[PDB]
Ligand binder design. Structure first.
Ligand SMILES: Nc1ncnc2c1ncn2[C@@H]1O[C@H](COP(=O)(O)OP(=O)(O)O)[C@@H](O)[C@H]1O
Ligand SMILES: Nc1ncnc2c1ncn2[C@@H]1O[C@H](COP(=O)(O)OP(=O)(O)O)[C@@H](O)[C@H]1O
Ligand SMILES: Nc1ccn([C@@H]2CS[C@H](CO)O2)c(=O)n1
Ligand SMILES: Nc1ccn([C@@H]2CS[C@H](CO)O2)c(=O)n1
Lengths: 222, 242
């Protein structure tokens, strides 16, 4: 019943900022924030930090918890009577698996066993899920350079050592999935989901007017 | 459902598969969900529908071996997969077996409760899971049980009690490769966890109904022929009380 729109894009592209703006446009519109605070303080251990520090040890543990915490929050938001309700997800279980987890496996931060377990867990976990299927995707496109700068602006302690090259790899995965559309998932419906690509490289005064209305254009078509 | 759910609990090589797979012949209304141990020693995920036509399903990793070789590294990963693969197998069997049976009884080889309160809990207590790992695991376990509500709830538990020494001997008899280095001390710690949960019933769990769930305790230390009759009798009596 609720339209579910995922906001995708690289680390610090400006997804939280944008959706928190967008949501004031309508009482019918709510956000499900990416549960990053629950990753910083496991409840507490900093599993986010452990993964950045020791990715060969902690990537699988991190990735499983990330995805579980997202499903939990997204499902909780669907449960709690509006004209045209829209729920904006900050990222999705598909970016969890096909971007982040996948990149860790490609980097050898998860081994073949860990990647197999992750995929089997993800397959089953989402096959139960079901009510989380997306009606649309908004891709906020920023260059890895922009993302690096915004990382510094925001000042999340765990993120400060992130190298440009890591952001580059993440950028290429997003481009393969959402712009080139060469990234194959095993979720069949996903190949028919409309994607709205917004460029957010400029300082926010420069284009935010046009961006909000593009989202308005987009949502009325779903 | 109308299906009665009975868990069979007990230590490694106590004789649960053997007993229950012979017992289930006694009625066409009785079926078993085996423990997915083969899925743990050969880790595999689903093939794409076109890929499976031209590529074999290959032997994957052995997370069971990895856990035994290095518990402090692999325990969390193993326990998470163990529990997921169990829930998958049990749910599928609930929604598919014993359709139109008169008095259906599904016997589970162990339960999600033993996954958490025996095995995972033992690993945490042995410093094979750290606080972060143990917190994550418990949180995931809690959430999954909330989800299914009463689906997997047990009507009864059968506890097959065997000494750690007996279990150790039976491990050798069975000769599962990954179990061959298991020391008496590990079996003993597991034993004490079962006794607290099922016999003395002092072990507290996050699931209130468990404290009331009926438990049958069977001593399975004797050679199989020596007690089987008596055991079958006790199980039939127990089931008629549920
Ligand atoms: N368009 C923009 N122009 C200038 N700063 C931005 C812009 N979008 C986001 N920022 C700033 O960049 C940082 C990252 O934005 P945030 O929305 O937290 O990213 P994300 O949610 O994608 O990780 C924050 O400090 C934010 O205020
Ligand atoms: N009562 C018994 N007497 C002699 N052998 C037994 C008895 N119960 C089980 N066994 C043998 O012990 C080994 C372990 O039994 P199994 O049913 O596989 O244990 P579990 O399922 O509890 O791990 C097997 O080799 C099996 O044939
Ligand atoms: N499944 C996910 C989701 C997000 N991330 C990273 C680490 S936290 C940061 C939030 O943008 O993104 C991640 O590494 N894996
Ligand atoms: N959650 C579980 C379930 C079973 N085990 C062990 C390893 S496999 C063996 C089968 O009896 O038991 C375990 O270590 N953890």
């Amino acid at each position: 019943r609720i339209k579910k729109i995922s906001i995708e894009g690289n680390i610090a592209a400006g997804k939280s900022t944008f959706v928190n703006i967008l949501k004031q446009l309508s009482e019918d519109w709510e956000v499900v924030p990416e549960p990053v605070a629950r990753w910083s303080n496991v409840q507490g251990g900093n599993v986010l930090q452990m993964m950045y520090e020791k990715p060969e040890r902690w990537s699988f543990t991190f990735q499983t918890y990330a995805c579980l915490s997202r499903i939990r929050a997204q499902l909780a938001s669907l449960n709690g009577d509006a004209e045209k309700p829209v729920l904006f997800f900050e990222r999705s279980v598909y970016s969890d698996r096909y971007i982040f987890a996948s990149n860790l496996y490609e980097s050898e931060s998860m081994n073949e066993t860990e990647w197999t377990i992750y995929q089997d867990w993800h397959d089953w976990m989402n096959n139960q899920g079901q009510s989380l299927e997306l009606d649309g995707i908004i891709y906020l496109q920023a260059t890895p350079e922009t993302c690096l700068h915004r990382i510094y602006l925001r000042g999340r302690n765990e993120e400060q050592g992130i190298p440009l090259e890591y952001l580059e790899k993440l950028h290429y995965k997003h481009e393969s999935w959402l712009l080139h559309r060469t990234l194959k998932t095993n979720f069949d419906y996903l190949q028919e989901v409309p994607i709205l690509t917004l460029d957010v490289n400029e300082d926010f005064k420069d284009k935010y007017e046009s961006l909000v209305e593009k989202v308005k254009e987009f949502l009325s078509t779903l």
